[PDB]
């Protein structure tokens, strides 16, 4: 998920611009729901996942807001001490304490129901138990008890008219989520919201803690600790699932890292290219980042240094020359199937070879497979979400930075060989692999492009539509499931705000019993593909001027 | 006028709700959601509560168990019961609005029942505040804000200490899964602020 907020000192022909691209994967019907709410203290417009009461993406004519996933470490696992003498109990603060338990029955269409028990301790629900070591692991979430408060904080924040009002609600949102603010005066802001534990001294948050009492959390950290900034001196706020702040720790997931190699740098490069950005320039960051190979910038210097003394006829050098001439933006050929340039395939083959020779070889099986992916993994239906730099690639990037990296190389991933030797060997593998498939004339290689699919199964893998309602787009784009843009105090209009979004395939998922799809079932699909957008209306006069239909209900509670 | 709810849809079908109190506003929202996305919402309900196998069969049993194992529904219901009347009106109004449209669908299914219910072989039931809360809770909280791999991390650390020795194995874990990396690009620049806490990075909880 990405976001860029451009403040007064960086905006052209406006005081602030907010552009959000939340990445949830692509579904039919649409992941988000367009909605405007007017009355009872609200006056808002935007779109929101699963029609939640609170709009995650929207504005109220004074301020605008959005979100990207936070990925802070708000979850720790406690290793509970069990006893075979006392089934269902665990040791906590010197006493054997009874677990809470509940029975659940799964009813099954055309099958037999299954009953099972869920167990819970003071530290959270039990995930798994090892009968052999008499240990049960309990998952502790810092937001446990605050789920409903988080839903309501996301609703009440829609009425805020300033930073202080809005941060009062940000302090009540307990999930790990980056929240963003912009307003009519050109103020911009960011808070890495959520509840985070105040851990005992000595607690390494990447690994489980004993559950016997001494390692229990002290409580929750106060809102003053959450990373936040208001009107940064840079003039902008950019995020693509990267770290909020210097010295702030990421999620403990092994496949997740915040390091020198980060795709957010592609957004910084575009925001810093020119002194100021207009709304159209800010929106065009979506198209460019969507098509940007993320590995070229990271590895091209290493590839150029390794091939610098080779002869003109050496194929390992020619592969690198092909990359040097490229800006890493992928574009489809006219066939709608292949990419104009072969660089992503060259990078994928080379990186896959490099990871096999370096990080994978240093890690014991079966953990080595966590580090083998190049990031170009997908499927014929295309990527299920965003593309990123893989964990193995991020660790390889620190190795190839040598002493520029702050991470101690406790094991030399090159195993005592000169890095140039291994880089060149992966280039020889790459030429062999690709020239056998495509021939020796690189200029005619027509490598496969990734496509995009609006899946009829939701992100859980559960049908939310029939299979034939799946929708296909030829060009994979590494962008928001939806995109929305809010422009405050434009100089080209007298309106204090202008806003746009795209909710594809359309607003409606309704299909009548006879098969007749609704008039708004697919009317935003082509607009999504072509980087188009529709206007978000807020005022009564703008809504009325664009009205298609209306209903008046008369209801008593 | 306190009973009045005006729904206006624009040229892309997007609904705009006009009402004079909290319950009525969220009632209009629920109503339009049930018109536009009833099947999607029903399947999201089942996904968030682990009741998919009831309608789709044996391939979703493990799914359903895993959803139920990852939350404590009575705790969610206790948070709902603690709400003020104003807050409760948001959830209650939303549920009540969906139900007004569901009841219309079930009274004239020949023209109003989304085709997918016929394909999948079942009919929609009413909603309560807990179900609306669980759409959010089961997506944003129980899945999106619930990420840990500490048991796998410990298995990698054990394998690294077996391969490299206790000290080098801990240091290789710090190379592959560093706690913090000062070269990470940060949304907040260092001139503005930095996070003040420093964390143990050698599994000292079991030292
Ligand atoms: Ca943790």
- Residues in chain A with CB shorter than 8 Å from the CB of B144 are 69, 175
Q: Residue A105: helix, strand or coil by DSSP?
A: strand
Distance from the B125 Cα atom to the nearest Cα atom in chain A, whole angstroms: 16
Cβ atoms of residues A220 and A196 within 8 Å = yes
Does residue B123 sit at the A interface (CB-CB below 8 Å)? Answer: no
The answer to whether the Cβ–Cβ distance between A49 and B199 falls below 8 Å is no
Q: Residue A91: helix, strand or coil by DSSP?
A: strand
Cβ atoms of residues A249 and B199 within 8 Å = yes
Q: How far is the CA of A269 from the centre of ligand 1 (A)?
A: 32
Cβ atoms of residues A109 and B54 within 8 Å = yes
What number of other Cβ atoms are within 10 A of residue A310's Cβ? 15
Q: Residue A414: helix, strand or coil by DSSP?
A: coil
- Closest-CA residue of A relative to B184 is A259
Distances (CA, A) of A474 to A59, A337, A469, B36, B67: 32, 7, 16, 27, 34
Q: Which two tokens stand for residue A318?
A: 């020619």
Residue (of B207, B201, B206, B205) closest to B170 by Cα position: B201
The answer to whether the Cβ–Cβ distance between B90 and A155 falls below 8 Å is yes
> CA B35 to CA A34: how far, in whole Å?
13
Q: Residue B47: helix, strand or coil by DSSP?
A: helix
> CA B190 to CA B183: how far, in whole Å?
11
**Which contiguous run of DSSP H or E holds residue A37?**
strand A32-39
Does residue B105 sit at the A interface (CB-CB below 8 Å)? Answer: no
Distance from the A169 Cα atom to the nearest Cα atom in chain B, whole angstroms: 14
Q: How far is the CA of B23 from the centre of ligand 1 (A)?
A: 39
- Residues in chain A with CB shorter than 8 Å from the CB of B165 are none
- Residues in chain A with CB shorter than 8 Å from the CB of B109 are 513
On whether the B1-147 domain is CATH 1.25.40.340, my answer is: no
The answer to whether the Cβ–Cβ distance between A229 and B193 falls below 8 Å is yes
The answer to whether the Cβ–Cβ distance between B181 and A177 falls below 8 Å is no
Domains in chain A (CATH in brackets) are: 1-72+146-290+452-536 (3.60.20.10), 73-145 (2.30.120.10), 291-451 (1.10.1400.10)
- Closest-CA residue of A relative to B51 is A106
Cβ burial of A110 (10 Å; 0-12, 13-18, 19+) is: exposed
Cβ atoms of residues A168 and A159 within 8 Å = no
Q: Which two tokens stand for residue B50?
A: 């682990």
What number of other Cβ atoms are within 10 A of residue A309's Cβ? 9
**DSSP code, position A533:** -
| CA dihedral over B51, B56, B61, B64, signed as positive or negative | negative
Query: Strand locations in A403-461, DSSP E?
Result: 452-454
Q: Which of A139, A151, A193, A517 has the most B C-beta neighbours within 10 Å, making it the best mutation to test the interface with B?
A: A151
Fold of B148-177: Helix Hairpins (1.10.287)
DSSP B160-200: HHHHH-HHHHHHHHHHHS-S--TTS-BSS-TTT--------
> CA B71 to CA A73: how far, in whole Å?
19
What number of other Cβ atoms are within 10 A of residue B165's Cβ? 12
Distance from the A501 Cα atom to the nearest Cα atom in chain B, whole angstroms: 11
Taking the domains of chain B in order of start, what are their residue ranges?
1-147, 148-177
The answer to whether the Cβ–Cβ distance between B39 and A464 falls below 8 Å is yes
Q: What is the dihedral of CA B52, B57, B58, B60, to 10 degrees?
A: -20
The answer to whether the Cβ–Cβ distance between A466 and B119 falls below 8 Å is yes
Q: Which of B205, B206, B207 has the most A C-beta neighbours within 10 Å, making it the best mutation to test the interface with A?
A: B205
Taking every pair of C-alpha atoms in chain A, what is the biggest distance, in angstroms? 84
Distance from the B99 Cα atom to the nearest Cα atom in chain A, whole angstroms: 13
Binding residues of A for Ca(2+): 73, 75-76, 205, 252
Cβ atoms of residues B202 and A203 within 8 Å = no
Nearest-by-Cβ selection for A143 from B18, B114, B141: B141
**DSSP code, position A94:** T
Buried b (16+ CB within 10 A) or exposed e, A488-508: bbbeeeeebbbbbbbbbbbbb
> CA B48 to CA A91: how far, in whole Å?
32
The answer to whether the Cβ–Cβ distance between A38 and B50 falls below 8 Å is no
Q: How far is the CA of A434 from the centre of ligand 1 (A)?
A: 42
Q: Which two tokens stand for residue A334?
A: 């006219």
The answer to whether the Cβ–Cβ distance between A204 and B202 falls below 8 Å is yes
C-alpha B3 chain-centroid distance: 31
Does residue B17 sit at the A interface (CB-CB below 8 Å)? Answer: yes
- Residues in chain B with CB shorter than 8 Å from the CB of A143 are 141, 145
**Which contiguous run of DSSP H or E holds residue A497?**
strand A497-502
**DSSP code, position A80:** E
Cβ atoms of residues B143 and A75 within 8 Å = no
Look up A390 and say whether it is catalytic: no
Query: Strand locations in A316-451, DSSP E?
Result: none
Long-range contacts from A466-474, C-beta under 8 angstroms, 24+ separation: A466/B115, A466/B116, A466/B119, A469/A28, A469/A29, A469/A511, A470/A28, A471/A28, A471/A505, A471/A522, A471/A525, A472/A381, A473/A525, A473/A528, A473/A529, A474/A332, A474/A336, A474/A337, A474/A449, A474/A529
Phi and psi at residue A472, to the nearest 5°: -125, 145
Nearest-by-Cβ selection for B16 from A36, A256, A508: A36
> CA A265 to CA A246: how far, in whole Å?
15
Cβ burial of A201 (10 Å; 0-12, 13-18, 19+) is: exposed
- Give yes or no for a cis peptide into A366 (omega within 30° of 0): yes
């Amino acid at each position: 998920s990405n976001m860029w907020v451009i403040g007064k000192s960086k905006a052209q022909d406006a005081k602030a611009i907010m552009v959000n691209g939340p990445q949830f994967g692509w579904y039919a019907p649409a992941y988000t729901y367009g909605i405007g709410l007017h009355g009872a203290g609200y006056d808002v417009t935007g779109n929101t996942p699963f029609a939640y009461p609170g709009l995650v993406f929207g504005h109220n004519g004074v301020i605008s807001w959005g979100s990207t996933a936070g990925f802070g470490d708000d979850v720790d696992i406690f290793a509970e001490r069990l006893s075979a003498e006392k089934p269902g109990y665990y040791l906590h603060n010197g006493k054997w304490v009874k677990m809470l338990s509940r029975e659940e029955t799964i009813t099954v269409k055309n099958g037999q129901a299954e009953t099972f028990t869920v167990w819970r301790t003071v530290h959270g629900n039990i995930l798994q138990t090892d009968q052999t070591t008499q240990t049960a692991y309990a998952k502790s979430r810092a937001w446990d008890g605050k789920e409903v408060a988080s839903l309501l904080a996301w609703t009440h924040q829609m009425k805020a008219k300033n930073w202080q009002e809005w941060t009062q609600q940000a302090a009540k949102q307990a999930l790990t989520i980056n929240w963003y603010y912009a307003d009519v005066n050109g103020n911009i802001g960011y808070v890495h919201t959520g509840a985070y534990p105040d851990r005992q001294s000595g607690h390494d948050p990447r690994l489980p803690v004993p559950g016997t009492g001494k390692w229990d959390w002290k409580g929750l950290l106060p809102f003053e600790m959450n990373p936040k900034v208001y009107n940064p001196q840079s003039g902008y706020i950019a995020n693509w699932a990267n770290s909020p702040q210097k010295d702030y720790p990421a999620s403990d997931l092994f496949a997740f890292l915040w390091g020198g190699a980060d795709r957010v740098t592609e957004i910084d490069r575009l925001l810093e290219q020119k002194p100021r950005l207009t709304a159209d320039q800010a929106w065009d960051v979506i198209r460019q980042t969507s098509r940007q190979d993320l590995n070229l910038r990271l590895f091209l210097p290493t590839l150029q240094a390794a091939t610098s003394g080779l002869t003109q006829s050496d194929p390992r050098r020619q592969l690198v020359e092909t990359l040097t001439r490229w800006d890493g933006i992928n574009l489809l050929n006219d066939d709608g199937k292949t990419w104009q340039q072969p660089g992503s395939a060259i990078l994928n083959v080379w990186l896959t070879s490099m990871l096999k020779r370096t990080v994978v070889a240093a890690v014991p099986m079966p953990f080595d497979k966590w580090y083998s992916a190049s990031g170009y993994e997908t499927t014929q239906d295309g990527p299920t979400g965003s593309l990123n730099i893989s964990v193995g690639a991020k660790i390889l990037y620190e190795a190839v930075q040598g002493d520029k990296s702050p991470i101690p190389q406790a094991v030399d991933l090159f195993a005592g060989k000169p890095q140039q030797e291994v880089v060149l060997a992966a280039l020889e593998d790459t030429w062999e692999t690709l020239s056998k498939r495509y021939g020796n004339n690189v200029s005619n290689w027509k490598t496969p492009a990734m496509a995009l699919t609006f899946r009829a199964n939701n992100f859980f893998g559960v049908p939310q539509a029939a299979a034939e309602e799946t929708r296909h787009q030829a060009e994979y784009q590494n962008r928001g499931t939806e995109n929305d843009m809010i422009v405050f105090s434009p100089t080209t209009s007298d309106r204090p705000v202008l806003a746009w979004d795209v909710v594809a395939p359309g607003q409606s998922g309704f299909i009548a019993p006879d098969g007749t799809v609704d008039k708004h079932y697919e009317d935003q699909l082509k607009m999504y593909e072509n980087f188009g957008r529709k206007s978000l209306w807020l005022t009564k006069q703008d809504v009325e001027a664009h009205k298609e239909s209306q209903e008046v209900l008369h209801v008593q509670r | 006028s306190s009973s009045e709810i005006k729904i206006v849809r624009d040229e892309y079908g997007m609904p705009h709700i006009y009402a004079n109190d909290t319950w009525h506003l969220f009632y209009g929202y629920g109503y339009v959601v049930a018109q536009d996305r009833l099947f999607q919402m029903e399947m999201a309900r089942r996904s968030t509560q682990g009741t998919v196998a009831e309608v789709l069969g044996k391939d979703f049993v493990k799914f359903d168990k895993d959803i139920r194992r990852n939350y404590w529904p009575d705790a969610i219901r206790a948070q709902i019961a603690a709400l003020s009347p104003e807050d409760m009106s948001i959830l209650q109004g939303y549920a009540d609005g969906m139900n007004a449209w569901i009841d219309k669908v079930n009274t004239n299914p020949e023209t109003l029942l989304p085709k997918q219910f016929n394909t999948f072989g079942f009919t929609p039931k009413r909603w309560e505040p807990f179900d609306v809360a669980m759409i959010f809770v089961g997506t944003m909280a129980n899945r999106f804000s619930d990420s840990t791999s500490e048991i796998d991390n410990l298995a990698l650390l054990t394998a690294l200490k077996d391969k490299y020795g206790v000290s080098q194995g801990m240091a290789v874990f710090n190379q592959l899964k560093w706690l913090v990396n000062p070269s990470a690009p940060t949304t907040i620049a260092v001139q503005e602020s930095n996070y003040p806490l420093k964390f143990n990075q050698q599994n000292s909880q079991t030292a």
